[PDB]
Design a protein around this ligand. Structure first.
Ligand SMILES: CCNC(=O)CCNC(=O)[C@H](O)C(C)(C)COP(=O)(O)OP(=O)(O)OC[C@H]1O[C@@H](n2cnc3c(N)ncnc32)[C@H](O)[C@@H]1OP(=O)(O)O
Ligand SMILES: C[C@H]1O[C@@H](n2cnc3c(N)ncnc32)[C@H](O)[C@@H]1O
Ligand code: MET
Ligand code: SF4
Lengths: 521, 538, 111
RNA sequence: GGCCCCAUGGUGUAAUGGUUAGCACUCUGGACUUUGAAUCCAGCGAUCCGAGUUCAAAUCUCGGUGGGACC
């Protein structure tokens, strides 16, 4: 939008896909189609006004790989296009014509931004710095000169847009995907620029994450087929520091092994094991006692040590015991258990009929709960590689939930287990509590690592609509829930807690939120 | 450094050739290449790719006519782009662990990354591997690489690789298709329909897609689904004309279902290309000859597109052990040459052959023929026998000129018709008979009494496809001499309309079209209806 | 090519309309066009012909455009070997005629 | 300053008084509607220059050109 010069009369220029521009004037309270510009031949990919004194210049970042600049003013030489507009019984005449044709890019031009005006201590200068962006990784800040009828280009350092600072010292742009680039000019040289740190994320959606036992770094995995590690940075602000691997297929399972070792699950019938390379370890210990955008992907790779098979289909869940002795995994109709050092089968269970959903190692390493998709659960008892004879189980009737279970968790002293399902039912276990319904579909559930001397057990419940309410149920209750600001917009995926308050919020909004509560509360 | 020395030679060549252009002087590229290489102490010739890699645009505008490389990539008339799907599993395995007795490594067959019926060493395969099977990345990379050779991309088409496509979750395929369409449109979308509407007004001017399938997924539901994608041609895989062979090959279906699939698809209005599989177990040479003759003698099949793939025993399959047990034997190369030569003498004129032989890497096949080139050997053999073939690809202007340099002199019309799957097919063409060189073609028929699309109910004749061969001409450009904008299509349209009005005795003409091509028919007063362009006949 | 022909047609307005669609920057040709417009009529003719390679018309115009430019014409018709053409432009009893005659007999007859 | 030596494809090279300079690296094209690069096939490159001699000359002579070591 724009106003007519030296008045409030509003005027609009619109660029359609028909390779020409249209203009509209709000005279008689109504915008009237006044003129059209039959310039280049492509889709219009942006228009920008610039009020220079009495006149108004126009920028057009065209898809035609060209830039054309006209200018409106007031009324051998060419034929300019002019008209008269009504303004309180005054027919004011305005004339427009082409000013310049600039062309320095190869692919389509996406965005242009004038230098915004600002104050030199109350002095409103009118600079003419201009910014351009195109597909082929090319930044050109065009500028005229004292006699440069064709504007003179400048430093071509360098994805649909590049934004510009108020003064112009800063400058930023986004990559084609994921991360983004941030440059700042340096005083020493007018042709000097330095990249600057910027935050990032999985930008598609995260499915799993973990808390390190030491408590200074968390690893997350998303559908972007990436893996990221986050740690606080000093000078405190947390920052992603490493991307240990990039995988061809999607990743949806994750488990921890040791101080630098972990296992991930993907869209294959294979299990992979990674350990931190030394260089990363020393670089990290140096920081704890600022990686950039591009250096990361070059030097954040990890080695692979194992390669496991056996499941007839793609893996769907994974977990490891606290004592770091055995692990559980299941594809989409059998259970396979792996020794840590041997990396071989220990016992195989084929008990359920439908797809497995979630496992739970007993915290005291005395049981192993299994919740599946067939509305039934199973429990297996380790004997005095002890076998895991089924201690107890449920049929299609003894099961309490009427729909598919989704989450399960133990007690801090392994006394009782707790299950949530899509039917918005909450239960406590034999069962020793009433249905703690919340009216919303349950997606995740977790418990405090330690219990109050009041014995008032507290529980975090992640619902299916981004809402995150919390409850409490001592042996025989709402305490606090998330704010509107502190609420996701999609289903929760995992709610892990700090261990030695804090916890983790792994939403489906490809956002990783961390929330602290009062230690006393 | 030598590199800057070759760069200086390149610049010298550039200035010499632009100077020649300014006064319209004609110069041999190789001559100046040799002279510049000698005068600068070069031991090796300069590559033409780097020669194209430095022309300034105000000269690339007009220097490409003397600079394009491998012109045959556009000697047909339409650019071709191939894409790769994500690896997956074929459906039949639901019964047993059998993909196909002769099929190569699949998702889990001793290959790190591969695809069913694909080793993983094809250039397309490495392109997909680098792209991580992402559609948008690989299509942009490939079109950029093609444009590097100074080739117009005014008209483009898409072919999809992959084992099976119909057998995939729907949301994934919708995501895939919208990504493809956004690749050319450049407009981010949210569903299929938004991408369709936007690509309607794009300038890349996409003209269609073709997909492979198998007769199990050939019911009218899937056909209607594909109608929503703008697909034009299909791949089935016939492998035989004898039912017993199917169970012998553990194919897992009947040739009948193939026949009704052909009939139904032809009624709908798609095109179809078959796959033929010579030298199979329990098949004599005379069996092959008889079945290949049957493939055209029977009005049951009379297909449109043909592809041939000779048997290739490969490690991993059951056939590998069968031959290894010394129980499945191939032919001598001379036998294969004779077989192919005889086959080529039998192809009906309307049918067009697209490819011969597989592209598998050499050091893997236990019976792979030495010759990567076979069409040439067959041509030599059929010269020896003094009998000629009449394939479409071998009588279009592009190939005929590029291989024999023969100029059409007297082009006229030709009409023919036959019966296939109960249809009253009809074939029209402009071509020069004396050199048997062809320029333009059209395929039009009457719809069957039984149909799936009610829009065709009564007084409806469908025009399956229309095309003029040659080379790419930008939609704004009119005459680089050549034969692609002389108004030829207009005559074919009006004559086909007249025939349908009188001889067919119908009342309304419908036609399938590419997403962009619709605008073309708008110039003739054709209006849209569903996914079909249509014109009233009264 | 029609734009160039319009330049040849010796009218600015025609050049204006055609160049409207020429896509070239007016910042480029417009100052040049005005410069060409200001300078002398017959000299305009000579300069446009020499810019359009129509050397015969360039020499014909420059012959009447002033005798002072005659030696320069010589250079052109000695660079473009147009001695014979200029033989018709000038007349006997002219020092220019005899000079151009000897130029014809000497310069072109190298070797 | 002369003595010697050398001058073959774009480069590395065989060959030699008579109908054709053969290879090698390199480059180009088709197979290919999966490939500039792969596999095969096919194709385009030439005796430093001028005088001699000889029926006939790249090979015999001289001169020139340029290059290479000698005191
Ligand atoms: C249906 C999907 N398959 C295809 O499209 C195959 C590729 N198609 C083509 O190459 C060409 O469209 C044809 C085979 C029809 C040959 O073109 P043909 O010679 O018949 O066109 P005509 O000479 O009869 O008419 C010329 C007009 O067609 C226009 N035209 C060419 N391509 C297109 C196109 N994709 N869309 C709309 N109009 C087009 C031209 O702009 C021209 O208009 P003009 O008046 O400005 O010159
Ligand atoms: C693409 C066509 O080729 C057949 N096909 C796929 N892989 C092979 C092979 N290794 N050998 C022979 N035929 C094959 C398919 O079955 C289909 O008919
Ligand atoms: C790539 S094999 C041919 C297409 C399909 N897989 C079929 O056999 O039907
Ligand atoms: S259906 Fe086709 S792609 Fe699938 S296993 Fe059989 S031959 Fe291979």
């Amino acid at each position: 939008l724009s106003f007519l010069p030296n008045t409030d009369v509003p005027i609009l220029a619109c660029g359609n896909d028909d390779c020409r521009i249209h203009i509209f004037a709000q005279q008689n309270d109504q915008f009237q189609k006044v003129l059209s510009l039959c310039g280049h031949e492509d889709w219009i990919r942006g228009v920008e006004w610039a009020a220079f004194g009495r006149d108004l210049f126009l920028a057009s970042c065209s898809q035609d790989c060209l830039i054309r600049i006209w200018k409106l003013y007031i009324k051998i030489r060419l034929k300019e296009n002019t008209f008269t507009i009504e303004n309180e019984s005054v027919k004011i005449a305005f004339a427009v014509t082409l000013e310049t044709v600039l062309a320095g890019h190869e692919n389509w031009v996406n965005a242009v931004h004038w230098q915004p005006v600002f104050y030199k201590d109350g002095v409103l200068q009118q600079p003419v710095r201009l910014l351009s962006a195109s597909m082929d990784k090319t930044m050109i800040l065009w500028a005229p000169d004292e006699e440069s009828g064709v504007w003179l280009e400048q430093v071509r350092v360098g994805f649909y847009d590049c934004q510009f600072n108020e003064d112009g010292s800063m400058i930023i742009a986004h990559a084609f995907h994921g991360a983004l680039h941030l440059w700042k000019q340096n005083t020493v040289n007018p042709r000097e620029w330095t990249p600057e740190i910027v935050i990032s994320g999985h930008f598609d959606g995260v499915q799993d994450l973990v808390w390190d036992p030491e408590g200074e770094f968390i690893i997350t995995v998303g559908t972007d087929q990436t893996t990221r590690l986050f740690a606080p940075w000093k000078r405190v602000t947390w920052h992603e520091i490493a991307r240990p691997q990039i995988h061809g297929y999607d990743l949806k399972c994750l488990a921890m092994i040791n101080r630098f070792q972990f296992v991930s699950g993907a869209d294959e019938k294979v299990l992979r094991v990674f350990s931190a390379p030394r260089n990363f370890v020393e670089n990290f210990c140096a920081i704890t006692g600022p990686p950039t955008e591009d250096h990361l992907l070059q030097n954040t790779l990890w080695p692979e040590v194992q390669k496991l098979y056996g499941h007839g289909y793609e893996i769907f869940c994974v977990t490891c015991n606290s004592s770091k002795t055995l692990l559980a995994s299941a594809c989409k109709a059998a259970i396979i258990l792996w020794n840590t050092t041997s990396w071989k089968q220990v016992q195989n269970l084929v008990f359920h009929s439908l797809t497995v959903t979630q496992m739970a190692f007993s915290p005291n390493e005395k049981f192993l709960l299994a919740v599946s998709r067939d509305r039934t659960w199973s429990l297996w008892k380790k004997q005095d590689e002890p076998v895991f004879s089924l201690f107890a189980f449920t049929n299609k009737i003894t099961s309490v939930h009427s729909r598919i279970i989704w989450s399960c968790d133990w007690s801090p002293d392994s006394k009782y287990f707790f299950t949530g399902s899509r039917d918005k039912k909450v239960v406590v276990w034999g069962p020793c509590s009433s249905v703690l319904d919340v009216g919303g579909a349950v997606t995740a559930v977790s418990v405090c690592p330690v219990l109050h001397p009041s014995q008032r057990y507290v529980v975090a419940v992640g619902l299916e609509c981004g809402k995150i309410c919390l409850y409490t149920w001592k042996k025989t209750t709402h305490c606090v829930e998330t704010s509107q600001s502190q609420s996701h917009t999609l289903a929760i995926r995992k709610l892990c807690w700090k261990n030695c308050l804090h916890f983790a919020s792994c939403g489906e909004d490809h956002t990783v939120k961390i929330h602290r509560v009062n230690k006393c509360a | 450094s030598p590199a800057e020395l070759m760069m200086l030679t390149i610049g010298d060549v550039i200035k010499q050739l632009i100077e020649a252009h300014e006064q319209g002087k004609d110069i041999d590229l190789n001559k100046v290449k040799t002279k510049t290489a000698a005068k600068y102490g070069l031991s090796a010739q300069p590559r033409l790719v780097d020669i194209i890699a430095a022309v300034p645009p105000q000269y690339r505008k007009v220097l490409m006519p003397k600079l394009k490389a491998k012109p045959i990539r556009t000697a047909s008339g339409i650019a071709v782009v191939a894409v790769m799907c994500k690896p997956h599993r074929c459906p039949h395995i639901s019964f047993t662990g059998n993909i196909c007795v002769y099929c190569p490594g699949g998702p889990d067959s001793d290959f790190e990354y591969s695809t069913q019926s694909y080793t993983g060493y094809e250039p397309t395969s490495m392109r997909a591997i680098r792209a991580r099977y992402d559609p948008f990345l690989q299509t942009r990379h490939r079109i950029e690489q093609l444009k590097q050779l100074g080739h117009s991309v005014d008209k483009v088409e898409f072919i999809v690789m992959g084992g099976t496509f119909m057998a995939l979750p729907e949301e994934y395929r919708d995501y895939f298709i919208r990504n493809l369409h956004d690749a050319l449109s450049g407009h981010t979308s949210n569903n299929i329909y938004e991408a369709v509407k936007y690509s309607e007004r794009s300038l890349t001017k996409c003209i269609g897609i073709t997909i492979e399938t198998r007769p199990d997924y050939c019911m009218k539901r899937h056909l209607s689904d594909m109608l929503t994608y703008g697909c034009t041609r299909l791949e089935i895989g016939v492998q035989s004309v004898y039912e017993d062979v199917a169970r012998d090959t553990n194919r897992g279906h009947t040739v009948k279902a193939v026949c009704e699939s052909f009939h139904l698809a032809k009624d709908s209005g798609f095109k179809v290309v078959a796959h033929m599989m010579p030298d199979l177990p329990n098949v004599g040479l005379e069996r092959d000859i008889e079945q290949f003759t049957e493939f055209f003698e029977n009005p049951a099949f009379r297909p449109d597109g043909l592809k041939l793939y000779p048997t290739l025993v490969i490690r991993g399959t059951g056939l590998y052990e069968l031959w290894k047990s010394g129980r499945y034997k191939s032919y001598s190369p001379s036998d294969l040459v004779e077989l192919v030569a005889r086959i080529l003498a039998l192809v009906p004129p309307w049918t067009r052959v697209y490819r011969v032989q597989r592209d598998i890497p050499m050091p893997l096949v236990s019976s792979g023929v030495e010759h990567g080139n076979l069409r040439e050997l067959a041509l030599a053999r059929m010269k020896d026998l003094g009998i000629q073939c009449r394939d479409v690809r071998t009588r279009e202007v592009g190939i005929q000129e590029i291989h024999h340099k023969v100029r059409p002199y007297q082009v006229e019309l030709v009409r023919r018709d036959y019966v296939a799957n109960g249809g009253w097919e009809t074939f029209l063409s402009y071509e020069d008979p004396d050199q048997d060189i062809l320029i333009g073609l059209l395929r039009l028929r009457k719809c069957s009494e039984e149909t799936f699309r009610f829009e065709l109910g009564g007084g409806v004749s469908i025009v399956r496809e229309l095309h003029v061969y040659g080379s790419v001409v930008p939609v704004s450009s009119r005459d680089p001499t050549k034969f692609q904008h002389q108004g030829f299509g207009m005559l074919l349209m009006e004559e086909a309309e007249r025939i349908a009005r009188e001889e067919h005795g119908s009342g309304k003409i419908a036609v399938i079209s590419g997403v962009g091509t619709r605008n073309y028919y708008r110039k003739i007063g054709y209006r849209l209806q569903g996914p079909y362009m249509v014109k009233m006949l009264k | 090519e029609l734009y160039d022909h319009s330049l040849g047609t010796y009218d600015f307005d025609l050049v204006l309309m055609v160049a409207e669609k020429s896509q070239k920057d007016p910042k480029e040709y417009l100052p040049f066009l005005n410069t060409l417009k200001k300078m002398e009529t017959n000299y305009q003719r000579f300069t446009i012909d020499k810019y359009l390679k129509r050397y015969e018309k360039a020499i014909g115009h420059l012959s009447k455009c002033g005798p002072e430019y005659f030696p320069e014409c010589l250079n052109l018709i000695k660079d473009k070997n147009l001695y014979n053409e200029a033989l018709k432009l000038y007349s006997p009893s002219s020092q220019q005629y005899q000079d151009i005659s000897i130029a014809y007999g000497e310069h072109l007859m190298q070797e």
